[PDB]
């Protein structure tokens, strides 16, 4: 009874992030990347690679 969208639907928000890294389990090219900063100001960012079709979690340090 409010007049804005209060919740997300079940399949109405897909991840926009995509970079063409080869998925080492099925051979997919599209891959949702995810960068968060772990260490201090002596080390860069660490990227989380989640594939699109299969969904295998992958991690690259630097």
């Amino acid at each position: 009874k409010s007049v804005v969208k209060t919740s997300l639907k079940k399949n109405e928000l897909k991840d926009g992030a995509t970079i063409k890294e080869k998925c080492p389990q099925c051979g997919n090219e599209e891959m949702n990347y995810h960068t968060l900063q772990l260490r201090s100001a002596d080390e860069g960012a660490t990227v989380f690679y989640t594939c699109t079709s299969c969904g295998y979690k992958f991690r690259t340090n630097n």
Partner: protein
């Protein structure tokens, strides 16, 4: 090592010193001042000379000087027996439980006897007969009770004697952790029945209740006048809270302990009390203090000022107050007010001895900046004693310095500076073979490097060579083998403390030591011209070190037992694979990676002079790199125009020379990190191929000789062994350094530039992002049609979104995922294609594609754009005014205003987007500062329980006291650092002959049985395939697995059933000079040589394989608790109340998606607050309250919540109005200290008048029966009550009345089906209720994550399966692989008592080792529980062997070496 020790300590007994400490010390201390004038120590004072030598005076007791006196103990006579503040809680329990008239406890003479008779059984190792003692039962007379006491005690004299006539128990009694549980349950229950009684049972006359304060006083509160009249009815057959003086507690508890001696002989003794002592109550009080020796009470000093010690200021103040109570002891010998200072003295003679032992158990005077620490504060902290100077000592023979790189030393080496090489020494006993070298060391002396600093004579006297000249050293090197005159030291020989040399070894250490590979063992290689420790690049990934100013600790071990373990157990060559998952950690790092993509390229062509120079640049026969003593080369790959060698052909030649000649070449088929399309059309440079040791195809990367699995260095490690794989990293370390010096590698500005064709591409895609912010903002506001940004009906909704944390989360997630698409379109069009320099020449890409340094995300932010600056997962924060910065319009639906950076680091970022990028930069730095403190304590807490846990010799995983944890290590007894190529059957077949003379069977078939386990395996294989369609509960149990019948290291063929299934699946789908029969024989011997070794510390490893990758997942939200706080609930604290408990419900395959979504609404709870639009309460003034409800429309809550209007009638008129009046009455008791509808029918009239009778003040009632839109009633209170906040009452009751709640279940939801698993996720746990829903749910597949609730319903093995699945879900989310063998050992420790025990104090409470508990935390709390127990520490846990100094029993202390003497 020439002073052996004979007698040794093996067990430590805790006890209490009695009153006759006076016998060991006739050196009492009276004068509280420690010195007088002329600086002397006054006699009878705390620095008396009968306590040890002091101030250049001899000891009055030893007669010895300050160097050789041990120091001795004195004692301070307390004039009145104060109580010991450790045991004060454990006498106040016995005080509050004893009857002051009969001097027994307030339990019966038979119920005291029963706990006295069960604890006698439990001090033997027999638990079953204690529960069978309560089986012995049958106007109660005291003759039938004395029969039963002589009947129960008759059974215990037989049950103990029977088990002692067998081998079940010994004369010293059996005691184990499960027996420790059952004893800590009776005594905790025995102190619950004795504590809660009112009257005696051998009489009726009962004692008044007590009271205490902060550990200084005990009061005896006034027995009220009802109960004295209940006393004097029997005794014939004062003021409020009178004080109890300390001596009159002893005169009670002495007489109680004299009477209950039987029960207290077994409360206080957990082993059988062979010495048959008495438990006396003087042990709780303090007759005397004891003064520690003077050496332990020396004065302090700082700068140039000496101060008095801490332990004299607290200890003179006891002795002045002892004097001051003797000053006032004369004031009754000649004889109110003086007893107001006498009783004042007893409180402060208590409060001084209380402040001597503790310091938090006192009161003090003022803020004396955390006043003077007692002897408990010296033990209980991170610092203090038991954790700073027993687990954490400082060491001799150790050096630290900044580290520096070197690719010219080996990988298993360290570069010691010449500063450290002339300081660190090794005691080398001079014998007939090292006399030529130790004479030369003494001649060089302690300045020239191959030298020595001092020698040790045969009587142990040292002779220092520092001040001596070149003649006193030559004339003392000549006397190293001269035998002395003495006959006591005729065995011994001299010891020359030579300097460190190139054959010595060293433990090296990076300082946060999170896993055992951070402390490895190197070989010394002494360098000139340095002051820095100097390391190779293979090691810098193991230590997690980099060359930015990091320091490392160098330890130098001082005997031959430790040199044999820094070479064979902790050396770097055996640390190639980490035990966390079996992945390699040692390899070449940054620029040797980016040189092998040029050397092994297809453009590389070397001539003859160049080819022979890169071979000898890295492979020297003189330094022992070769295997042939003559460097062999290859024919060129081009003959006729000009002879040229290929760069792949150098990698062939270096493997031709460093591998052994008798073994054939390697065979490997692998991949690269570089895709084939970077090299051109139809290239095959992604496929790595080695055939007979020759690189024939493909470049070499991080994925080959980096720290990567199944590369070339990982494969040579498997076929050739760790010594060859450590040479190939050194040979390639020198190969890709001479090639770099001849052919360099740079990175410039032109590497970072897009071409003008491709630079127009990123402009046109970013031109289509100016509309993206509004369209996502028009979507969440549910507008459309491209409403403009200045729409007043749009800006009103954005302000509505802004005030809610929920709605702003939706608008962030929509707009972030919509602009990450434009970020992913710019990158996926530009970065291979729009760049100016293509791949091999563009070194910025070649550092990212090779894995040398960086990622493709770093290249995209440099060349294309930064992207969305996501803050705490959400997006850029916002002010109160709807502004994200002062630069932007309020409620701006620009993508840039929300933090989307359309700029790159090549061209620059604008000032607005430089400010958001500093926001994202800082949340990566404040999260780092809070990262390491979280997972540091999680790892420490695991490594005390899982710390004496080791592989036994019968392959069972046991704890230090012998309690069993697992029966094999992981079910297969395979070491993690061995099972890498164990299931790589294609690799083991291509290298069959080279892998055959490693796992050499010819010299091995006479020490092990062969056919006994192969025969039993085929029975268990044939029988198991006949029963595979059956479920697991209908599995017949004829054939237990072959590992449970045969030892895997004794019998060939005994093999885990999962390895056998993979091996038979390989041989039946692959028909390929090698049979299938002899390939079975190889892979079954390889299983036998990859086993875990006995003595392996699998408890430390399993705890270091969880705490160390948990320093990697501290991050925020990317529904269930994530990461470390989830891991701190399972492992730590054993949370029975998880914050977010769930339940996964597998629906059937014939229940539809509509019938699933209908089933969701029939579970989720519905508050009465969820169907209400408004509540209008009109208060008119007798008083009245017309509460009018407005529900939603009946076609809205019956569709959203499946709630009919017949339910709301029954919910309001049975539940709500009762709860409402229970809040109105509760408030008054704490205070006096549209339309209109009438003309009801008979149904509504009868509904009204009945509910009026059921309630107190409702008097009118109506509900909308036609439409279900309103209820209506009228609370009339009295004509006297004042103003009442009625609407605040009603809102709290509407949100607590439930319409339909299945208990403990808050919400059901139907998520996306993961891999076809149609399931339902339930916010809450109730297994009992979901069994009733069998028409929709596969109830034999329901799955939770509340481990304490799976344990209660399904049992201990189901809970144990949940723990290994829930620790796995934490690590698999962060793409971190840990092996299940670590997780099974953590789970089998937590379920070792049938319960779900934590890693904390409360989980550790049921253990054997007292020193493990004391060293963890609350040291003197566990010490109290151990001294009262009279607990013998067996000294078996490694936390108790480091205290007493005994050899640890894990690894090389898990056996004994015995020498075999030939003569009789």
């Amino acid at each position: 090592i020439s002073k052996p020790v004979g007698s040794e300590i093996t067990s430590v007994d805790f006890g209490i010193l009695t009153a006759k400490i006076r016998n060991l010390s006739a050196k009492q201390i009276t004068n509280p001042t420690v010195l007088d004038n002329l600086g002397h120590p006054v006699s009878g004072g705390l620095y008396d000379l009968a306590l040890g030598a002091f101030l250049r005076n001899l000891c009055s007791t030893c007669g010895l000087d300050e160097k050789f006196c041990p120091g001795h103990q004195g004692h301070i006579e307390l004039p009145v027996p104060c109580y010991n503040p450790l045991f004060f809680n454990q006498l106040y329990i016995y005080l509050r439980a004893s009857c002051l008239f009969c001097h027994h406890f307030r339990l019966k003479s038979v119920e005291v006897h029963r706990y006295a008779c069960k604890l006698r059984l439990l001090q033997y190792g027999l638990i079953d007969e204690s529960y069978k003692l309560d089986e012995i039962t049958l106007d109660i007379s005291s003759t039938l009770l004395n029969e039963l006491k002589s009947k129960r005690s008759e059974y215990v004299d037989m049950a103990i004697a029977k088990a002692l006539s067998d081998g079940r128990t010994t004369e010293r009694g059996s005691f184990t952790a499960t027996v420790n549980d059952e004893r800590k349950k009776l005594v905790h229950e025995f102190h619950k029945k004795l504590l809660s009684r009112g009257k005696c049972d051998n009489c009726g006359m009962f004692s008044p209740k007590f009271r205490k304060d902060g550990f200084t006083k005990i009061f005896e509160t006034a027995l009220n006048e009802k109960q004295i009249t209940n006393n004097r009815v029997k005794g014939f057959i004062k003021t409020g809270s009178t004080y109890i003086l300390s001596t009159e507690v002893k005169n009670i508890l002495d007489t109680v302990f004299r009477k209950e001696q039987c029960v207290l002989q077994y409360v206080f003794h957990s082993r059988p009390n062979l010495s048959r002592k008495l438990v006396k109550a003087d042990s709780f009080f303090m007759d005397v203090l004891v003064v520690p020796p003077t050496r332990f009470r020396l004065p302090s000093k700082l700068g140039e000022e000496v101060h008095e010690n801490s332990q004299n200021q607290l200890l003179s103040k006891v002795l002045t107050t002892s004097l001051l109570i003797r000053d006032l002891n004369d004031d009754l010998s000649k004889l109110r007010v003086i007893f107001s200072r006498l009783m004042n003295a007893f409180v402060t003679i208590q409060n001084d001895v209380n402040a001597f032992i503790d310091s938090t158990k006192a009161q003090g005077r003022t803020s004396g900046k955390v006043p003077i620490p007692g002897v408990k504060q010296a033990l209980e902290k991170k610092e203090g004693l038991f954790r700073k100077h027993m687990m954490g000592k400082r060491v001799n023979y150790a050096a630290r310095s900044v580290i520096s790189p070197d690719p010219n030393i080996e990988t298993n080496e360290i570069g010691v500076p010449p500063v450290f090489a002339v300081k660190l020494t090794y005691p080398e006993p001079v014998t007939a073979y090292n006399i030529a070298e130790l004479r030369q060391a003494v001649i060089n002396g302690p300045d020239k490097w191959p030298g020595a600093t001092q020698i040790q004579n045969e009587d142990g006297s040292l002779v220092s060579l520092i001040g001596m000249s070149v003649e006193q050293r030559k004339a003392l090197a000549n006397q190293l083998l001269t035998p002395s005159s003495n006959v006591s030291t005729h065995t011994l020989n001299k010891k020359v403390y030579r300097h460190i040399k190139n054959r010595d070894v060293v433990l090296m250490n990076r300082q946060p030591t999170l896993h055992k590979a951070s402390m490895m063992g190197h070989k010394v290689r002494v360098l000139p011209n340095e002051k820095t420790l100097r390391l190779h690049y293979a090691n810098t990934g193991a230590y997690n070190a980099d060359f930015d100013g990091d320091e490392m600790n160098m330890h130098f071990p001082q005997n031959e037992n430790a040199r044999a373990e820094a070479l064979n157990l902790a050396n770097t060559d055996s640390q190639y694979l980490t035990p966390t998952s079996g992945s390699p950690v040692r390899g070449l790092i940054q620029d040797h990676i980016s040189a092998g993509v040029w050397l092994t390229s297809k453009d590389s062509f070397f001539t003859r002079e160049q080819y022979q120079q890169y071979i000898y640049g890295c492979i020297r026969p003189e330094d022992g790199h070769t295997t042939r003593s003559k460097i062999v080369t290859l024919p060129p790959t081009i003959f006729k125009p000009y002879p040229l060698w290929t760069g792949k052909q150098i990698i062939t030649t270096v493997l031709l020379n460093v591998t052994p000649p008798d073994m054939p070449g390697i065979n490997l088929i692998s991949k690269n990190k570089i895709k084939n399309e970077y090299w051109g059309k139809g290239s095959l440079e992604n496929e790595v191929l080695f055939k007979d040791g020759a690189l024939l195809c493909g470049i070499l990367d991080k994925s080959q000789y980096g720290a990567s699995k199944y590369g070339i260095v990982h494969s040579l490690h498997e076929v050739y062994g760790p010594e060859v794989a450590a040479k190939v990293l050194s040979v390639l370390g020198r190969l890709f350094t001479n090639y770099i010096t001849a052919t360099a590698f740079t990175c410039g500005m032109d590497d970072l530039r897009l071409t003008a064709e491709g630079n127009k591409w990123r402009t046109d895609i970013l031109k289509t992002s100016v509309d993206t912010g509004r369209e996502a903002a028009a979507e969440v506001t549910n507008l459309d049609k491209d409403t403009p940004a200045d729409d007043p009906e749009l800006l009103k909704r954005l302000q509505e979104i802004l005030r809610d944390n929920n709605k702003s989360g939706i608008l962030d997630a929509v707009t972030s995922s919509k602009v990450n698409a434009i970020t992913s379109q710019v990158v996926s069009k530009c970065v291979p294609d729009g760049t100016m320099k293509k791949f091999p020449c563009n070194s910025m890409q070649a550092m990212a594609l090779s894995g040398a340094k960086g990622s493709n995300v770093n290249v995209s932010q440099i060349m294309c754009l930064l992207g969305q600056q996501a803050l705490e997962g959400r997006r850029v924060p916002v002010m109160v005014s709807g502004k994200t910065l002062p630069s932007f319009k309020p409620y701006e639906t620009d993508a840039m205003a929300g933090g989307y950076v359309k700029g790159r680091f090549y061209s620059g970022i604008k000032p607005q987007e430089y400010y958001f990028h500093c926001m994202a930069g800082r949340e990566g730095l404040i999260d780092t500062a809070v990262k390491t403190s979280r997972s540091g304590y999680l790892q420490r807490c695991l490594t005390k329980q899982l710390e004496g846990v080791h592989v036994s010799y019968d392959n069972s995983i046991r704890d230090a006291d012998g309690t069993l944890v697992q029966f094999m290590y992981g079910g297969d007894a395979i070491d993690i650092t061995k099972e890498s190529h164990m299931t790589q059957f294609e690799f083991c077949l291509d290298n069959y002959y080279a892998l055959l003379k490693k796992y050499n069977p010819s010299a091995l078939i006479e020490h092990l049985d062969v056919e006994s386990a192969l025969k039993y395996s085929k029975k268990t294989l044939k029988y198991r395939k006949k029963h595979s369609k059956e479920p697991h509960y209908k599995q017949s149990v004829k054939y237990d697995p072959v590992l449970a019948k045969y030892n895997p290291a004794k019998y060939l063929g005994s093999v885990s059933e999962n390895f056998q299934d993979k091996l038979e699946s390989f041989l039946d789908k692959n028909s390929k000079g090698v049979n299938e029969k002899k390939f079975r024989a190889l892979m079954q011997l390889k299983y036998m040589r990859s086993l875990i070794n006995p003595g392996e510390a699998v408890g430390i490893i399993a705890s270091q394989s969880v705490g160390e990758p948990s320093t990697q997942m501290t991050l925020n939200t990317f529904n269930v608790t994530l990461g470390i706080p989830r891991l701190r609930e399972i492992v730590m604290t054993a949370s029975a109340a998880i914050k977010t408990p769930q339940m996964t419900l597998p629906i059937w395959n014939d229940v539809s998606d509509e019938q699933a979504d209908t089933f969701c609404k029939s579970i989720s709870k519905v508050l009465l607050s969820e169907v209400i639009d408004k509540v209008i309460v009109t208060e008119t003034t007798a008083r009245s309250y017309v509460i009018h409800m407005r529900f939603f429309d009946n076609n809205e809550y019956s569709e959203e919540y499946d709630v009919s209007k017949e339910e709301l009638q029954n919910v309001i008129s049975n539940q709500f109005i009762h709860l409402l009046e229970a809040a109105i009455v509760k408030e008054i008791k704490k205070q006096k200290r549209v339309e209109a509808n009438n003309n009801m029918n008979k149904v509504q009239r009868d509904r009204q008048s009945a509910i009026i009778s059921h309630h107190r003040f409702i008097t009118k009632y109506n509900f909308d029966d036609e439409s279900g839109k309103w209820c209506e009633f009228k609370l009339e209170l009295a004509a006297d009550t004042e103003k009442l906040l009625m609407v605040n009452i009603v809102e709290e009751i509407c949100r607590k009345s439930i319409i339909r709640q299945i208990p403990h279940i808050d919400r059901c939801v139907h998520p996306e089906p993961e891999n076809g698993k149609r399931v339902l996720v339930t916010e809450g746990v109730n297994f009992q209720a979901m069994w009733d829903q069998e028409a929709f749910i596969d109830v034999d597949g329901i799955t939770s994550n509340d481990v304490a609730a799976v344990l209660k319903t399904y049992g201990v093995e189901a809970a144990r399966n949940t723990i290994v699945n829930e620790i796995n879900n934490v690590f698999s989310r962060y793409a971190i692989s840990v092996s299940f063998r670590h997780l099974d050992l953590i789970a089998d420790m937590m379920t070792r008592q049938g319960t779900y025990l934590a890693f904390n104090r409360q989980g550790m409470e049921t253990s054997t080792s007292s020193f493990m508990k004391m060293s963890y935390e609350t040291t003197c709390q566990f010490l109290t529980k151990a001294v009262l127990d009279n607990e013998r520490e067996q000294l078996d846990s490694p936390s108790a062997r480091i205290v007493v100094g005994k050899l640890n029993n894990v690894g090389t202390g898990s056996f004994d070496v015995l020498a075999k003497v030939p003569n009789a």
